[PDB]
Design an enzyme around this catalytic site. Structure first.
Site, PDB file in Angstrom:
ATOM      1  N   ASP A  12       4.296 -25.271 -53.117  1.00 57.14           N
ATOM      2  CA  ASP A  12       4.772 -23.951 -53.548  1.00 57.14           C
ATOM      3  C   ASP A  12       5.959 -23.714 -52.623  1.00 57.14           C
ATOM      4  OD1 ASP A  12       5.279 -21.192 -53.822  1.00 57.14           O
ATOM      5  OD2 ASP A  12       3.301 -20.563 -53.094  1.00 57.14           O
ATOM      6  N   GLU A 177       5.345 -21.089 -61.395  1.00 56.72           N
ATOM      7  CA  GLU A 177       4.365 -20.531 -60.450  1.00 56.72           C
ATOM      8  C   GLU A 177       3.172 -19.886 -61.190  1.00 56.72           C
ATOM      9  OE1 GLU A 177       6.865 -18.052 -57.970  1.00 56.72           O
ATOM     10  OE2 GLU A 177       7.980 -19.840 -57.351  1.00 56.72           O
ATOM     11  N   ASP A 201       1.494 -11.119 -59.330  1.00 59.06           N
ATOM     12  CA  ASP A 201       2.042 -11.750 -58.151  1.00 59.06           C
ATOM     13  C   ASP A 201       2.823 -10.785 -57.273  1.00 59.06           C
ATOM     14  OD1 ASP A 201       3.308 -13.490 -56.304  1.00 59.06           O
ATOM     15  OD2 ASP A 201       3.666 -15.056 -57.815  1.00 59.06           O
TER      16      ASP A 201
HETATM   17 MG   LIG Z   1       4.816 -17.006 -54.527  1.00 64.02          MG
END
Ligand SMILES: [Mg+2]
Ligand SMILES: Nc1ncnc2c1nc(Br)n2[C@@H]1O[C@H](CO)[C@@H](O)[C@H]1O
Length: 390
Positions: A12, A177, A201
């Site tokens: 990530d 993501e 998020d």
């Molecule tokens: Mg993130």
């Protein structure tokens, strides 16, 4: 015959922090770095003698603001003239220059003035994540899945691959993501039939809402929404302004012009903020904060909640907008997934759970780790090369 294959990694590559995982023995291991941190700051610092990456870079930022680079993800694949770039530059202590309408960060490094493309800074962060993985695995790593925001265009996606290639990684795939967070929970492994998944998020500086439809393991991005001006740093700011006022009332002194005092206050505020996610109150103890005055105080979770109340409530506007864009009603969402450390805030969880009429939130995978977790699951899938039996 055939030599054992090295594990592939999931990275990530985050705006503020990055995270690396590996799928082995039927499970994901999120890999801590050598300071014991399961996430690594996406920071690179430059001095006369060294290039520091991750915790070492973030930990020396106070006195070297001009040569400590962060937020390169906000520049990656963008033109210097892009209005997003122009606005963001006002908040950064480091220099951003124009090279053929392409932004470069310019620093003092090893006796010279040096400029780097955003993909070069991101490649430095990726080199650290690869080394973190290699320290755990005990062998060189080649293959990686890297994630990006769902809203990234072709240029932003290619510049991210370029960063991986500069770091010596073979980029198996660039994946979204929110898709990686859904993969982390096995939401693409539930069989036949459409599932609507909402990813919530909440980052350090931005907030992203994504709606995905999953059908027979196939992902479709139905809607994206969010707030570029909503994140964890805004909650820290509210606590800072509160304690600056408190010091004024108690000691009749305004600390706001001593950068060190404000910084020490902000650092303590962010930790108090984290404690408040697990406890109903938290102490704040700073020695010789200003004019040799010790600042020993406390804050209740209720007072922190009141201080950020409007900010927490505003997370529901992009949820309602995304639902309108996806042409879906809240009851039609099958799964809710939390991403980002700021989602550990109980009040944030409660507001979203109340909005979805008491529904359970998937938060069992650390929200600051779920994206790397999903990326690691996919990286292991992508390197399989099974030959069918007769
Ligand atoms: Mg993130
Ligand atoms: N337990 C936690 N409770 C509240 N916030 C948290 C927590 N853990 C993390 Br990590 N954060 C925040 O997540 C953001 C990531 O860039 C920063 O604003 C961190 O302060």
């Amino acid at each position: 015959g055939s030599m054992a294959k090295a594990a592939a990694i999931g990275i990530d590559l985050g705006t503020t922090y990055s995270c690396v995982g590996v799928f082995q023995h039927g499970k994901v291991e999120i890999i801590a770095n050598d300071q014991g941190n399961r996430t690594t700051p996406s920071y690179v610092a430059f001095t006369d003698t060294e290039r520091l990456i991750g915790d070492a870079a973030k930990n020396q930022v106070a006195l070297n603001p001009q040569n400590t680079v962060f937020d390169a993800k906000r520049l990656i694949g963008r033109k210097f003239g892009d209005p997003v770039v122009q606005s963001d530059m006002k908040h950064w202590p480091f220099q951003v220059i124009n090279d053929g309408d392409k932004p470069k960060v310019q620093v003092s490094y090893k006796g010279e003035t040096k400029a780097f493309y955003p993909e070069e800074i991101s490649s430095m962060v990726l080199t650290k994540m690869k080394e973190i993985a290699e320290a755990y695995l005990g062998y060189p790593v080649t293959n990686a899945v890297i994630t990006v925001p769902a809203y990234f265009n072709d240029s932003q996606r290619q510049a991210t691959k370029d960063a991986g290639v500069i770091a010596g990684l073979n980029v198996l795939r660039i994946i979204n993501e929110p898709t990686a967070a859904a993969i982390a929970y096995g939401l693409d492994r539930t069989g036949k039939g459409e599932r609507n998944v909402l990813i919530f998020d909440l980052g350090g500086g931005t907030f992203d809402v994504s709606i995905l439809t999953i059908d027979d393991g196939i992902f479709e991005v139905k809607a994206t929404a969010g707030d570029t001006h909503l994140g964890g740093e805004d909650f820290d700011n509210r606590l800072v302004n509160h304690f600056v006022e408190e010091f004024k009332r108690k000691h009749k002194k305004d600390i706001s012009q001593n950068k060190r005092a404000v910084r020490r206050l902000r650092t303590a505020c962010e930790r108090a903020k984290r404690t408040l996610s697990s406890s109903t109150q938290a102490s704040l103890e700073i020695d010789s904060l200003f004019e040799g005055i010790d600042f020993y105080t406390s804050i209740t979770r209720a007072r922190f909640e009141e201080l950020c109340s409007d900010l927490f409530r505003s997370t529901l506007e992009p949820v309602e907008k995304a639902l309108r864009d996806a042409k879906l009603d809240k009851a039609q969402i099958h799964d809710l997934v939390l991403v980002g450390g700021s989602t550990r805030i109980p009040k944030v969880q409660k507001l979203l759970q109340d909005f979805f009429n008491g529904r359970d939130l998937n938060k069992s995978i650390n929200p600051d780790e779920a994206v790397a977790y999903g990326a690691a699951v996919q990286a292991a899938i992508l390197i399989k090369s099974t030959r069918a039996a007769a």
